[PDB]
Structure 1
Amino acid sequence: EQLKHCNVILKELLSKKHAAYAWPFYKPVDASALGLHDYHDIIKHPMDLSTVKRKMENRDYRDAQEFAADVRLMFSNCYKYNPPDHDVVAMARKLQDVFEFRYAKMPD
């Protein structure tokens, strides 16, 4: 089971080592509530960790490829939105490296 393996990676992100970057990307972006019209115009497809959790819980992602694709989109959205130069962007890059390393071992 590949799904099982993916669950292990999620636990680590929420565990502690990678929690620093987990809580920031955990919450979504309520453009409607907050007020970010430009966020919906440029991005149009806001994705957050909170939403990803719901998918795994409902088994929306019956595959690893689907999960990886969702993560890549979230990382690319932040980069497009905000240029590299803040702590936020740097936080994503740090996670990207870790994901890559784990993706190598993913394949069964």
Structure 2
Amino acid sequence: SMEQVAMELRLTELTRLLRSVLDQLQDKDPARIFAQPVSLKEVPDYLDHIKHPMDFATMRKRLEAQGYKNLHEFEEDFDLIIDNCMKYNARDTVFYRAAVRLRDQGGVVLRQARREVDSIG
């Protein structure tokens, strides 16, 4: 149907916007602490601590399969990245501080992206 196509054009446009949002967010991680999943080789206990791991690469795979239906879904994943790190790592570590900074800087990008997704529909 033409209705199905139109919905698909809307998913495609959201995916275009979310990709630019992802690059902006990722630029707030110059150190690349959040670029890839935490290694179960190097942190064998990770899954006993963190039930839902997330990283930017895994967000990118999902994005390119157009697996984010809305911005809420994309934000949930971004927040897991931050939130997982602030749980597993202690306050005085470089990892915890890098999540605090990504959260703060990312919150600005997302404040406007929420207006763009509403605005453009």
Superposed pair shares fold, TM > 0.5: yes
Instruction: Provide the TM-score with structure 2 as the length reference.
Output: 0.74
Residues 40 and 54 of structure 1, relative CA distance in 2, 3 Å threshold: same
Contact 2:53 2:81 in 1 (8 A): yes
Partner of 2:90: 83
> Is 1:24 paired with 2:36?
no
Structure 1 gap ranges (5+): none
Tell me the TM-score normalised to structure 1 length.
0.82
Number of the residue aligned with 1:9: 21
Alignment of 1:47 with 2:71, yes or no, is no
Tell whether the 8 Å contact from 2:21 to 2:110 is kept in structure 1 after alignment.
no
Percent identity between the aligned chains?
Answer: 30
Is the CA contact 1:46–1:74 (under 8 Å) kept in the aligned structure 2?
yes
Contact persistence 2:25–2:106 (CA under 8 A): no
Q: Deviations over 1:27-67 (max 9, x none)?
A: 21231xx1533211110222111100000000111211100
| Structure 2: tracts of 5 or more residues without a match | 1-12
- In the alignment of these two chains, the number of paired residues is 103
From the superposition, tell whether residues 19 and 93 of structure 1 become closer, same or farther in structure 2 (CA, over 3 Å). Answer: closer
- Work out which of the two has the higher radius of gyration on C-alpha atoms and give 1 or 2: 2
Equivalent-residue separation in structure 2 for 1:49 and 1:27 (angstroms): 6
Does 1:59 pair with 2:66? yes
